[PDB]
From Swiss-Prot, chain B:
Any GO CC annotation of this UniProt entry: fatty acid synthase complex
The protein's role, per its UniProt record: Catalyzes the hydration of trans-2-enoyl-CoA with a chain-length of 4-6 carbon atoms, forming the corresponding (3R)-3-hydroxyacyl-CoA.
The keyword Cytoplasm is annotated on this UniProt entry: no
GO molecular function: (3R)-hydroxyacyl-[acyl-carrier-protein] dehydratase activity; fatty acid synthase activity
Organism: Aeromonas caviae (Aeromonas punctata)
Binding-site positions, a (3R)-3-hydroxyacyl-CoA: 31-36, 54, 83
Domain MaoC-like: 4-118
GO biological process, alphabetically ordered: fatty acid biosynthetic process
Protein name: (R)-specific enoyl-CoA hydratase
Lineage: Bacteria, Pseudomonadati, Pseudomonadota, Gammaproteobacteria, Aeromonadales
Length: 132, 133
């Protein structure tokens, strides 16, 4: 297509804290105490509050919209598999990698992954986007 | 008595994502794509005006799944999303989920998840897979 090609990657790291998780709860209408209440979380197998899977996934929008392909890009599709919990207060690493470019349309497919602080795969999937 | 989850059960909610909400999502997601904020830039696109992040629209499914159906205690296992139409900042949308399958080997449910525009057109569609409460 253009300067975009298979193999190009972009990443970012972010540590979602309690205030941010609460802000996302308000936007998403997902007020699960498991994400917001330390006392409640302690009564579950998670033991501590975990970040909304969709808050973790939002980072893919940051990568696609601000890095690769960047400004002007438009989401067409996104698949998401939630594998591991991410505890509030812990940092994660988000990464997108171009895996394919459609030959007859300005469309790209990228693998989207979220890694825990320990380097484990917490979220995985693929994004399909229209190029800028 | 306790109400069992059943195929065909549904839930919905409506919400308006205005400038403040879109700005908050941009900050959380790190997605400051001008398509979602700048009217001058947006005017040069086929959308003509600022649109709400598709991933912000999709986040409403988390609210329905965790608060109503299946509800409290539900754990997200997967979510597929296809973005079909834009939602303009300030406009209302309706999020709808419906149970389509309940596995019997494990307490897992599959639900169709859709976002409709204020005009009644499909903006986002897909399926969620969740572990039961």
């Amino acid at each position: 297509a253009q300067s975009l090609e298979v193999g190009q990657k972009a990443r970012l790291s972010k540590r979602f804290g309690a205030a941010e998780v609460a802000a996302f709860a308000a936007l998403s209408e997902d007020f699960n105490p498991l994400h917001l209440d330390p006392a409640f979380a302690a009564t579950t197998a998670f033991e501590r509050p975990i970040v909304h899977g969709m808050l973790l996934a939002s980072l893919f929008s940051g990568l696609l919209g601000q890095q690769l392909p960047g400004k002007g890009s438009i989401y067409l599709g996104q698949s998401l598999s939630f594998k591991l919990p991410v505890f509030v207060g812990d940092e994660v690493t988000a990464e997108v990698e171009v895996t394919a470019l459609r030959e007859d349309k300005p469309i790209a497919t990228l693998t989207t992954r979220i890694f825990t602080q320990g380097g484990a795969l917490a979220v995985t999937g693929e994004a399909v986007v229209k190029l800028p």
